[PDB]
C-alpha cells in the first residue's frame, strides 16, 4: 500500500536487523579475507554493510531495481506469458525474484556437481548467510507490499546509516596503537598523552606538543565540514509562484521544490556502478578468458578496456576513473584528474535526463497532480497547458544532479576521512533523506522514542 509514512517505517525496522547480523561476518574464529582494499567502492557496497568480506547485503539493494525492470516496462512480446492458469504483474514480480537469486549464487560457494561457477575468488557462503537473514526480511517485505506494483523509499537510508557505524567500528579496531587513549580520535597518539586523554577534554588542540606521528584522524574531523556548509545552502534555493490556491476557499500554502530535489537520486546510482566496476575489472582481464592477444590489438596505448600488462584495476575504464588514488594528494597527472572530472560530469547529466521520463518527475506528471489538488487553475491561459508549466522542469532536473556530480569528484581530493575516499556519498544522502522522512509524512515526523 502507498503511504509516505509506511514506506519510511518499513526501511527503519529492517535497518536494525542489519547491525545484529553484522558481528559474526566481522571476525569469527581465525577467519581472514585476502585482498579487496579501497574506500569509494566500500561506501557504495555498504548498504548497511561493512568489514573485510565483500558483498553481504549487495543482492538486496539490487532487488528494488529489478522490480522496476518489468513492472513498468513493455515491448519485447511475452506479455501475459504462455504460462498456464494466468495472472500477470505478480508473475513479472516472481521473475524479478529469480534474477536476484541468480546473482547471489555465483559469489557464494555451491556444490561440486551442478556447480557452473567458481575456480577463481568466491566462497563466503557461511559469511553471506547471516546478512541474507536480515536482507531476507527486506525481500519478503518487498514481495507482499508490492503485489506486482511497488516503489518504496528504500535506497537512501541503509547506505547513509552505515558510515556513522563504520567510524565507531574503526575506533574499536586495533591499529597497533599503544593501549588506549580513552577518547581522542582512535589512533596516532603517543603513550604519555594516552593516560591523560581519558580524564576529560583538556590537552588536545591547546597543549604543548602532541600528535604528528602519522595522523589519519585530524583528516576525519575537517572532512565533514567541507560537505556540511555547501549542502545546506543548496537545500534552500526554490521556485514557488502559487496564488489563490486550493480552488476557492482561497487560502494559500506555498508549493516548494528545491530543484536539487528529484535530481539527487540518479547521482547516487551514477556513483554506484562506477566504483564497483573498478574493484571487479582485475578478474575479467587476468583470470577469466580470452584477452591475451585481444588486449594488445585493442589497446593502441591511448587507453582501452582490458588493457595488457596492467597491475591494480585494468587500464581503460579504471584509468580515466582515478590517478594513483593517493587520497587526492597526487593529482598533477595532467591526464587522469582532468578526465575523471569530465567523465563523471557527463555521465551524471545523462542519468538526470533519463530520470525525467517515467521514473521520476516530468512536467506531464506534475500537470495532472496540480489539476487534482487545484492551484485555482493556476491563473492560466485559454488552454495551452502543453507548454506553460513545462520549461523549468527539464532544466531543474538536469541542474540539480549536475552540480552534485561535479562537486563529488573534487570533494574526494579535498579530504575524505579515515577512509580517505569514503565519506562524501553517505553524508549528502542524510540531508535528502531527512526531507523524505518528515516533510512527505505531511503531518508529524519520525517515530520511536515514546513507548508502546
Amino acid at each position: 500500500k502507498i503511504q509516505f509514512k509506511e514506506k519510511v517505517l518499513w526501511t527503519a525496522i529492517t535497518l536494525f536487523i542489519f547491525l545484529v547480523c553484522c558481528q559474526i561476518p566481522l571476525f569469527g574464529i581465525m577467519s581472514s579475507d585476502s585482498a579487496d582494499p579501497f574506500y569509494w567502492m566500500r561506501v557504495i557496497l555498504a548498504s548497511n554493510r561493512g568489514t573485510l568480506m565483500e558483498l553481504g547485503i549487495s543482492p538486496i539493494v539490487t532487488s528494488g531495481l529489478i522490480m522496476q525492470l518489468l513492472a513498468g516496462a513493455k515491448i519485447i512480446e511475452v506479455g501475459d506469458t504462455p504460462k498456464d492458469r494466468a495472472l500477470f504483474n505478480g508473475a513479472q514480480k516472481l521473475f524479478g525474484m529469480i534474477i536476484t537469486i541468480g546473482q547471489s549464487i555465483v559469489y557464494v560457494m555451491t556444490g561440486m556437481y551442478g556447480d557452473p561457477s567458481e575456480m577463481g575468488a568466491g566462497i563466503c557462503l557461511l559469511i553471506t548467510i547471516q546478512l541474507f537473514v536480515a536482507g531476507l526480511i527486506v525481500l519478503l517485505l518487498d514481495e507482499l507490499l508490492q503485489k506486482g506494483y511497488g516503489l518504496g523509499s528504500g535506497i537512501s537510508l541503509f547506505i547513509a546509516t552505515n558510515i556513522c557505524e563504520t567510524i565507531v567500528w574503526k575506533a574499536f579496531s586495533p591499529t597497533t596503537v599503544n593501549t588506549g587513549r580513552g577518547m581522542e580520535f582512535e589512533g596516532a597518539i603517543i603513550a604519555l598523552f594516552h593516560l591523560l586523554a581519558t580524564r576529560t577534554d583538556k590537552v588536545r588542540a591547546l597543549r604543548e606538543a602532541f600528535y604528528r606521528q602519522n595522523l589519519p584522524n585530524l583528516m576525519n574531523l575537517i572532512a565533514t565540514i567541507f560537505v556540511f556548509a555547501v549542502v545546506i545552502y543548496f537545500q534552500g534555493f526554490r521556485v514557488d509562484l502559487p496564488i489563490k490556491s486550493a480552488r476557492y476557499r482561497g487560502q494559500y500554502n506555498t508549493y516548494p521544490i528545491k530543484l536539487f530535489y528529484t535530481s539527487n537520486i540518479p547521482i547516487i546510482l551514477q556513483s554506484a556502478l562506477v566504483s564497483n566496476l573498478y574493484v571487479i575489472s582485475q578478474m575479467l582481464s587476468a583470470r577469466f578468458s580470452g584477452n591475451l592477444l585481444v588486449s594488445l590489438l585493442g589497446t593502441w596505448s591511448d587507453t582501452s578496456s582490458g588493457g595488457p600488462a596492467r597491475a591494480y584495476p585494468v587500464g581503460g575504464l579504471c584509468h580515466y576513473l582515478s590517478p594513483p588514488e593517493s587520497f587526492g594528494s597526487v593529482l598533477e597527472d595532467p591526464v587522469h584528474a582532468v578526465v575523471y572530472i569530465v567523465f563523471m560530469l557527463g555521465s551524471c547529466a545523462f542519468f538526470s535526463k533519463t530520470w525525467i521520463e517515467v521514473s521520476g518527475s516530468s512536467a506531464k506528471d506534475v500537470a495532472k497532480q496540480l489539476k487534482e489538488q487545484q492551484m485555482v487553475m493556476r491563473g492560466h491561459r485559454e488552454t495551452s497547458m502543453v507548454h506553460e508549466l513545462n520549461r523549468y522542469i527539464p532544466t531543474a532536473a538536469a541542474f540539480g544532479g549536475l552540480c552534485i556530480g561535479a562537486l563529488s569528484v573534487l570533494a574526494d581530493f579535498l579530504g575524505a576521512i579515515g577512509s580517505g575516499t569514503g565519506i562524501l556519498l553517505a553524508v549528502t544522502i542524510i540531508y535528502q533523506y531527512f526531507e523524505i522522512f518528515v516533510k512527505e509524512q505531511s503531518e508529524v515526523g519520525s517515530m520511536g522514542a515514546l513507548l508502546f
Binding site: 557504495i44 557496497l45 558483498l55 549487495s58 543482492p59 539493494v61 539490487t62 531495481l65 529489478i66 522496476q68 525492470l69 513498468g72 516496462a73 513493455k74 515491448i75 519485447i76 546473482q103 547471489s104 555465483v106 559469489y107 546510482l269 554506484a272 556502478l273 564497483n276 566496476l277 571487479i280 533519463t354 521520463e357 517515467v358 521514473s359
Partner: peptide, 17 residues
Amino acid sequence: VFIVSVGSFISVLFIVI
C-alpha cells in the same frame, strides 16, 4: 521505457558480482 531500465540493470548487475 524498457530500454532505459535494461541499461540501468546491466550497470547494477556488476555491483552484486
